Amino acid sequence: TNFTISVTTEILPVSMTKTSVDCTMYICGDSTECSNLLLQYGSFCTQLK
């Protein structure tokens, strides 16, 4: 015999903070010899980028 108007909240995530990973300076830092050694590992950093 009666009606009620109810308002409900629904929270759904949309996205997240985009992050860029620099493989070379995170793994080997500023060392040139470490970068030369890592260059023989292939293209892992390029694939992850």
Binding site: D22, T24, M25, D30
Partner: protein, 50 residues
């Protein structure tokens, strides 16, 4: 493609040198030496080595 970096150019090593040098000849040109079981330990510190 790549990343931007600043190449090193000069050194700003910050530790003033110690007033004396390390006497490495004390353990090398000693007039006598100790045995293996009871050696002689000479702590060399606060100096500049070569």
């Amino acid at each position: 493609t790549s990343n931007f970096r600043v190449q090193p150019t000069e050194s700003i090593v910050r530790f003033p040198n110690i007033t004396n040098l390390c006497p490495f000849d004390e353990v090398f040109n000693a007039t006598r030496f100790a045995s293996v079981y009871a050696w002689n330990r000479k702590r060399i510190s606060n100096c500049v080595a070569d």
